[PDB]
Amino acid sequence: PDDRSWLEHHVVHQYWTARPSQFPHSLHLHSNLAAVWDQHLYSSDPLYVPDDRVLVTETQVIRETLWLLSGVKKLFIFQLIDGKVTVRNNIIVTHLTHSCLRSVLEQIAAYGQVVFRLQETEAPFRTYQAFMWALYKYFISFKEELAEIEKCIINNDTTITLAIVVDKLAPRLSQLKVLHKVFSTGVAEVPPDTRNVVRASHLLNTLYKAILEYDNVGEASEQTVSLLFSLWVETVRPYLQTVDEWIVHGHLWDGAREFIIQRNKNVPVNHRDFWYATYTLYSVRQHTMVSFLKPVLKQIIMAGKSMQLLKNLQCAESTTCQAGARDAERKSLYTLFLESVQSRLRTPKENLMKMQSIAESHLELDDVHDPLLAINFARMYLEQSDFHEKDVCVDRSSESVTCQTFELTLRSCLYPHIDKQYLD
Amino acid sequence: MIHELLLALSGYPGSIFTWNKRSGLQVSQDFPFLHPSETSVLNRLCRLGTDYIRFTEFIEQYTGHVQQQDHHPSQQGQGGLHGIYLRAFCTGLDSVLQPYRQALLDLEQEFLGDPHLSISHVNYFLDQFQLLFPSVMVVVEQIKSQKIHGCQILETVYKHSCGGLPPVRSALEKILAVCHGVMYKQLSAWM
Amino acid sequence: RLHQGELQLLAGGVLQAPQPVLVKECELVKDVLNVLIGVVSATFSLCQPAQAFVVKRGVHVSGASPESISSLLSEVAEYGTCYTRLSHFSLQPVLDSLYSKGLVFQAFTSGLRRYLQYYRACVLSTPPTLSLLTIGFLFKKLGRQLRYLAELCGVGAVLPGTCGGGPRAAFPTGVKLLSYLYQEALHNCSNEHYPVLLSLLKTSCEPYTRFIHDWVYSGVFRDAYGEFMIQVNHEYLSFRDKLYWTHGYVLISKEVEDCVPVFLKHIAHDIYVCGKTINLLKLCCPRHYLCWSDVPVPRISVIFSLEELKEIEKDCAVYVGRMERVARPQVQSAADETAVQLSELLTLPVLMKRSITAPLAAHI
Amino acid sequence: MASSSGAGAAAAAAAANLNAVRETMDVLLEISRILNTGLDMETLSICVRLCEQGINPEALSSVIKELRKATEALKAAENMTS
Amino acid sequence: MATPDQKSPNVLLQNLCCRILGRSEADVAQQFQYAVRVIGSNFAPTVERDEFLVAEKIKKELIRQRREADAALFSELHRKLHSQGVLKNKWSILYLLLSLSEDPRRQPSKVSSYATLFAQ
């Protein structure tokens, strides 16, 4: 334990352990502000009983703050009680007053609580899966910066203060606040008993309204506008895929019944109501109209009905199943939309030869290479070794003045291609 | 420890990260030298490692044994996972873990380059596989639990192909392509 | 070290944990390379009856726990054990007069020697600068394939005395070898071993296909180990009656599945009748113009390249026409890819059928 | 040639017993945590070794309480001197 | 087979004191003497020497502390420990653990600095 204790003294103190790590600090008034404040309090009120306060390092506080912001649960200073991140009451820093440190940590804890609520997302449905994917991408982007901050802290070469870290995270903190509000409105405000279709429609409408708000907010929301655009693109990807499948195959494949149109299985194509009853909009509540598709929703419905008819009419093998552009080779509505958006925004045997060379370098001249064995060994060793087989930048910040309105951008990049396919 | 952690993720359980046939890879105990938040991060990484270990165990269970030439191949499908499609499934799983192995090797190289790196860098770098592996593990567990047999497993994979994770979608497409290659081989023989 | 001390304190001295010996990795790599050649090292000792490396207790590696490092090294030692034991099983060298496994088995062992040579070449190609985990992953597939093939061939690395597995069946020979190869190819058709197994099957059939060729063209029974379905009874070959034809050359009919290759079963009877007829004609009228033609008989061989197969078919047709007038790739290169194009296009049984029966049917 | 194989199996059995002991110790640590005993890994291991030696739990409890009071006074002095 | 030098209970107690105080063995000499005095004192037999009875008492005490989940967890852990059979004195360890249990609900009576006067 002695060698281990020496390391433990030199590898960073057990202060994170409930064992009180006493650390040497400068007694200068500017450096001993906590101790001087304790002395003043002790001097001023004869009723003041000194509470047990834990002395934490500023670097240690920063590291724990980054870990909280990294989404770590069960922090020592910030405790999670009923899903609320709460600061332990007995924590003090040398350079801060207990009340001031508590206030700053309370702001940080509020943001952490927001993250924690956002961190708990399971993704049970296609739309929720897309929202989770976008959230994961956002959290990845945040974790990158967090890791860079942690690396700079680890290097310990430069004085990093809590203020410096807060300022560095300020743009990210603003983006996080906007995301928290948008997420709360889009998901948290959705009643739990709402139908998956209804939940999806409410989320989609919330996304559209948020998009309008951030587009009207101008340049200052550029990072937020980009985030929202990525969220919208991701959320439409499954919806656009379902629309594409209905248009191309004439079959509405909707396992969760999240699309605004439901097919009545009871209406066969030869049924008189096939044209009218086979595909029903989930119209029971007028709220089921998809706002982003709403300008084109009627054309979409007509196209889907027509494609369902053609695929549902026993068409003779129509040559217009051209072997040319496969629907799999057709750019998906998500893919076509992303490509059109980027283009308008200007936005973003050989193995056998290798095995033969390896054999010549390592096999004796006289041993005939067995081509079945040569291929097998290539795949198992050389192709195993050489397996170094290791995005729509919808950021309006570049040409925000030239970027179309979210609705205008949608109409110009997505709706024209959909209308073309519908017409065809 | 980082090398030890990767070894646990590489299938070498140690004293800190114990592999349990029932519990999988787990942090053995609270150690006095780590902050409880570091313990939580370690437990999340051990969750990912446990899933990887379970995947490797499944791969060995259904692919790791030489095929007994029992005269009746049809009965192998009942008790044990068997069939050419089962071999293709195991091969696909190993191929999907190949990129994970490559990423682990890159992590190893980085840790060799910088001894001061912390677990947060790994958690950042490995998060993509922390999202990929749970979904494929769920799909495999569903296949095992439902005793999906022959090409009917392919239908389940298609059902699983409808997942929301783009990387999981691509991986399941690769696996489905391998299984369809085998199916096409059988179909070619028949036709 | 702290954690191990804590564990020892908890274990109250009863768990005599082997002392962790810290070794430099730049050494562990050497031991790994030796294992890849089946060589015992300072940390891994070779258990002779198992032909297996045994890890020295208490191996510590810097940056990893000695128990986890020991686990990794145990897996690597298992791979090295498989390599060395498989080499020893395949190392049965000389078809000496005591060799009872036959020429098909000897050819199989020659193909296995070629495979092990390729494996050795790969091991030597492994740069010593690679990481232990990188090396382990790179050789993981190859070791799995080697273990699978060793179990498939019954030449599994397990020491015969300690593995309570029932008596390892003798490696099949002749028709039994062909049927075993066909069954293993069917069972391993999805594995990385399928092309190697096809190559080995071809190589083992090569002596058997030569025996078939000699039997069909000259009526000569070349089965030294009794693997061929036809036996020659010289006592009845001197007879000049029906008994010469019925008893001089006898196709082993009762165990047709064991005496005739499973892939040749559909043509085995015709081959037997052809060889019997050729031997009868040689015995009764050796100077018959059909019987005395010096016309070269077309080669009977297994072909796995579609281009080579078409070329063989054309050459066979030309040979047949020339002989009638007179009477009156697979696995052999490296970079070559057509050699296996048929093997990927066609199934091993269908490929073998097309490759073998066409020359067989032509000669019959 | 046979003998070399046995030592590996014996070592594996010993390692399995040790791993089982480690698992049991982890279970005991978890139980102590649930019981809010306040023992750390080193302290818990020391306590386990002492308990294996037969110490009376009442005497041990009184000693622990007195040691905890002394440790708290020493920790307060160390935190005041830093 | 040289059973690891399990230092005599006095040395083990000294190491434990050093670990608990976070001071070297030389700094805990008075505490070591106090420990020796306590250990040499006759202690009454534990109230319960039955592993299952001790587990049930622990569960009841946890329930009295309104920790029913902790009582169930304790009973399960006790069953597992009894089945593992690694510990020779299950009753003694259970009694120790019971004696060391702390009620999270009872606000720690902050030990008046005055207690240090008797420590000297």
UniProtKB/Swiss-Prot annotation, chain A:
Q: Which residues form a coiled coil?
A: none
Q: Which residues of the full protein are shown?
A: 210 to 701 of 1024
Its organism's taxonomic lineage begins at: Eukaryota, Metazoa, Chordata, Craniata, Vertebrata
Q: What does this protein do?
A: Component of the gamma-tubulin ring complex (gTuRC) which mediates microtubule nucleation. The gTuRC regulates the minus-end nucleation of alpha-beta tubulin heterodimers that grow into microtubule protafilaments, a critical step in centrosome duplication and spindle formation.
Q: In which tissues is it expressed?
A: Widely expressed, with highest levels in heart and skeletal muscle and moderate levels in brain.
Q: Which family does it belong to?
A: Belongs to the TUBGCP family.
Subunit relationships: Component of the gamma-tubulin ring complex (gTuRC) consisting of TUBGCP2, TUBGCP3, TUBGCP4, TUBGCP5 and TUBGCP6 and gamma-tubulin TUBG1 or TUBG2. TUBGCP2, TUBGCP3, TUBGCP4, TUBGCP5 and TUBGCP6 assemble in a 5:5:2:1:1 stoichiometry; each is associated with a gamma-tubulin, thereby arranging 14 gamma-tubulins in a helical manner. Gamma-tubulin at the first position is blocked by TUBGCP3 at the last position, allowing 13 protafilaments to grow into a microtubule.
What is the species of this protein?
A: Homo sapiens
Compartments where found: Cytoplasm, Cytoskeleton, Microtubule organizing center, Centrosome
This one is known as Gamma-tubulin complex component 5
From Swiss-Prot, chain B:
Organism superkingdom = Eukaryota
The signal peptide, as residue positions, is none
Tissue specificity: Ubiquitously expressed.
**Example GO BP:** spindle assembly
Subcellular compartments: Cytoplasm, Cytoskeleton, Microtubule organizing center, Centrosome
Record disease entry: Microcephaly and chorioretinopathy, autosomal recessive, 3: A disorder characterized by congenital microcephaly and chorioretinal dysplasia associated with poor vision and nystagmus. Variable ocular anomalies include microphthalmia, retinal folding, retinal detachment, optic nerve hypoplasia, absence of retinal vessels, round areas of chorioretinal atrophy, and attenuated electroretinogram. Most patients have mild developmental delay and mild learning difficulties.
Could you tell me what this protein does? Answer: Component of the gamma-tubulin ring complex (gTuRC) which mediates microtubule nucleation. The gTuRC regulates the minus-end nucleation of alpha-beta tubulin heterodimers that grow into microtubule protafilaments, a critical step in centrosome duplication and spindle formation.
Q: Which family does it belong to?
A: Belongs to the TUBGCP family.
Q: Name one GO cellular component term.
A: membrane
The protein's name in its UniProt record? Gamma-tubulin complex component 4
The species this protein belongs to is Homo sapiens (Human)
Q: Which GO terms describe its molecular function?
A: gamma-tubulin binding; structural constituent of cytoskeleton
In the record, what lineage is assigned to the organism producing the protein? Eukaryota, Metazoa, Chordata, Craniata, Vertebrata
The UniProt keywords, alphabetically, are:
Cytoplasm, Cytoskeleton, Intellectual disability, Microtubule, Primary microcephaly
UniProtKB/Swiss-Prot annotation, chain D:
| Entry protein name | Mitotic-spindle organizing protein 1
Q: Which Pfam families match?
A: MOZART1 (PF12554)
Q: Which GO terms describe its biological process?
A: gamma-tubulin complex localization; microtubule nucleation by interphase microtubule organizing center; mitotic spindle assembly
Compartments, record wording: Cytoplasm, Cytoskeleton, Microtubule organizing center, Centrosome; Cytoplasm, Cytoskeleton, Spindle
Gene behind this protein: MZT1
Name where it mostly resides: cytoplasm
Similarity-based family: Belongs to the MOZART1 family.
Look up and give the organism this protein is from: Homo sapiens
Reading the lineage from the top rank, the first entry is Eukaryota
Gene Ontology CC annotation, any one? interphase microtubule organizing center
User: Is the Acetylation keyword given for this protein?
Assistant: yes
Q: What is this protein's function per UniProt?
A: Required for the recruitment and the assembly of the gamma-tubulin ring complex (gTuRC) at the centrosome. The gTuRC regulates the minus-end nucleation of alpha-beta tubulin heterodimers that grow into microtubule protafilaments, a critical step in centrosome duplication and spindle formation.
Q: Which InterPro entries match?
A: MZT1
Disulfide bonds, which pairs? none
Which residues are annotated as modified residue N-acetylalanine in the UniProt record?
2
Report quaternary structure and partners: Associates with the gamma-tubulin ring complex (gTuRC) consisting of TUBGCP2, TUBGCP3, TUBGCP4, TUBGCP5 and TUBGCP6 and gamma-tubulin TUBG1 or TUBG2; within the complex, interacts with TUBGCP3 and TUBGCP6 to form a luminal bridge with actin that stabilizes the initial structure during complex assembly. Interacts with TUBG1.
Q: Which UniProt keywords apply?
A: Acetylation, Cytoplasm, Cytoskeleton
Swiss-Prot record, chain E:
Q: Which residues carry this modification: N-acetylalanine?
A: 2
Q: Which domain of life is it from?
A: Eukaryota
Where does this protein reside within or beyond the cell? Cytoplasm, Cytoskeleton, Microtubule organizing center, Centrosome
Tissues and organs where the protein is expressed, per its UniProt entry: Ubiquitously expressed.
Q: Residue positions of the PTM Phosphoserine? A: 113
Q: How does it assemble?
A: Component of the gamma-tubulin ring complex (gTuRC) consisting of TUBGCP2, TUBGCP3, TUBGCP4, TUBGCP5 and TUBGCP6 and gamma-tubulin TUBG1 or TUBG2. TUBGCP2, TUBGCP3, TUBGCP4, TUBGCP5 and TUBGCP6 assemble in a 5:5:2:1:1 stoichiometry; each is associated with a gamma-tubulin, thereby arranging 14 gamma-tubulins in a helical manner. Gamma-tubulin at the first position is blocked by TUBGCP3 at the last position, allowing 13 protafilaments to grow into a microtubule.
Family membership: Belongs to the TUBGCP family.
Q: What does this protein do?
A: Component of the gamma-tubulin ring complex (gTuRC) which mediates microtubule nucleation. The gTuRC regulates the minus-end nucleation of alpha-beta tubulin heterodimers that grow into microtubule protafilaments, a critical step in centrosome duplication and spindle formation.
Instruction: Quote the protein name from its UniProt record.
Output: Gamma-tubulin complex component 3
* Lineage, broadest ranks: Eukaryota, Metazoa, Chordata, Craniata, Vertebrata
* Gene responsible for this protein: TUBGCP3
First-to-last residue of the parent protein present: 1 to 120 of 907
